[PDB]
Design a protein around this ligand. Sequence first.
Ligand SMILES: [Ca+2]
Ligand SMILES: [Ca+2]
Ligand SMILES: [Ca+2]
Ligand SMILES: [Ca+2]
Ligand SMILES: [Ca+2]
Ligand SMILES: [Ca+2]
Lengths: 236, 98, 72, 72, 72
Amino acid sequence: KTEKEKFKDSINNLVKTEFTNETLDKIQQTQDLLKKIPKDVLEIYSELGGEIYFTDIDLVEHKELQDLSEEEKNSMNSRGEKVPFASRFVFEKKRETPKLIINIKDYAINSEQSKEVYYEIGKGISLDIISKDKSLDPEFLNLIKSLSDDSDSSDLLFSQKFKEKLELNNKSIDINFIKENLTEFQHAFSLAFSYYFAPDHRTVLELYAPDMFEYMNKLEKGGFEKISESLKKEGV
Amino acid sequence: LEKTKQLRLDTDQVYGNIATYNFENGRVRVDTGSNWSEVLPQIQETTARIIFNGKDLNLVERRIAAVNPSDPLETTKPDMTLKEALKIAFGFNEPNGN
Amino acid sequence: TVPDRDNDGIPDSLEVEGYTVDVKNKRTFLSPWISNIHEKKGLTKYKSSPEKWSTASDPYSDFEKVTGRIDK
Amino acid sequence: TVPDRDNDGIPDSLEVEGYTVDVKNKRTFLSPWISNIHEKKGLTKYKSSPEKWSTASDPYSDFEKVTGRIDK
Amino acid sequence: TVPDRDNDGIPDSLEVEGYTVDVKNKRTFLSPWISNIHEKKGLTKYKSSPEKWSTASDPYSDFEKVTGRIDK
Ligand SMILES: [Ca+2]
Ligand SMILES: [Ca+2]
Ligand SMILES: [Ca+2]
Ligand SMILES: [Ca+2]
Ligand SMILES: [Ca+2]
Ligand SMILES: [Ca+2]
């Protein structure tokens, strides 16, 4: 009855009915990686001139990144450390136009390389969700204040430089503190973004940071909608 | 037998059941339709044996899962090194690198 | 859908015209035999019968035999 | 939904790329391995095979051995 | 619906944070532990494990023991 029906589903991913190429499966896996973020965040990125590219050229000898600094060749990954640019396979370049170049891989099997694209995407739309009046939103400031008190979400999300700098200030109370550490305040949003949209990492965010999970959940079902509207109305 | 006094006892095989979990009510119930002679030949062919008598001269036979490179299901197991097998199967440690 | 008469889990055109099994990261992947892609990797070309659940009539299917889901 | 081939209650990317089991208030939570949190607690980083119900082919699954819901 | 992992008929917040059992007219009610009310009645404050159907691993659930629906 349901025996062969569930035996078929238990091998429904295993058998491959028509294969016919090799680099065509990386293209499909990249597209199905990308199309499972919602439709709204892509419009939020494309409002300010966002660009998503699929190449097989590794990100060293690509034609559009041949002329770059050393402080952008040494930028930080999701884990905090700098990545060698021979090793980096996904990069967002926004020196004048926000452009993100994705090298294709087999992303459905590889849910570790599938998190760096989510991290750089959350890096992309970061400030335009954080900033409203050219300043960090005070609701997000209350959020960072509440997360630094909890001893678990603190060392989940913040980089160690942030925690070893904040107790020197013992209180994110200064107007200069936000203006001096905006990269960390952006990184804390992009890390929670990548934890939210990697579909086996949501329960990490739910239990280790329950009030950051609710911030991203409120952003998920209509916050993107409102920010896309308020950007597209001023888009003319 | 009364002249030479030699009579010993061999052990050919051992029957016996497995008791598995029950998710419904947490209890553990012996299933009487499955013995270890359906299980132990499958352990003896996908693992690797390590015997060790460094604890007061007693042999402690253990078995760690290891990859067989000519079987498509068995090539899905994680790569197991001798240091990791000695560390997780018996209880070695490396407090100074050694 | 893809027809499968014998109910062994591998479709019929694969059993007639060849197939192979390999793992990719840690997951097995049953595939049709493409000539100049698998022959340089050194896999095998299995062919079977699309009407029998087990082509040698023994109690192990073609799928369990080539996949390893068998009595070891 | 999340893929789970072997049907042992733990997804494929966690079994391949590392996981652990942690309690928070009184409830156990199986989670992917994060070194910034699971090293200070002194936990273990497990890796199993995503297409076997029990990687050592014994009758206790990979879920049960790490969770403790097993024969005591 | 309230969560109940172990399926012993009593919610997890009550098992972790305290509960008690008392009859009102001729009917049994299971209640969260309120020190302002339940202490003067002379009742008892139970706690148990929200993951185990029976906290002492004997074949009587935590509901059956405190309620009276047990082998006498
Ligand atoms: Ca067939
Ligand atoms: Ca067949
Ligand atoms: Ca699994
Ligand atoms: Ca498994
Ligand atoms: Ca309960
Ligand atoms: Ca209980």
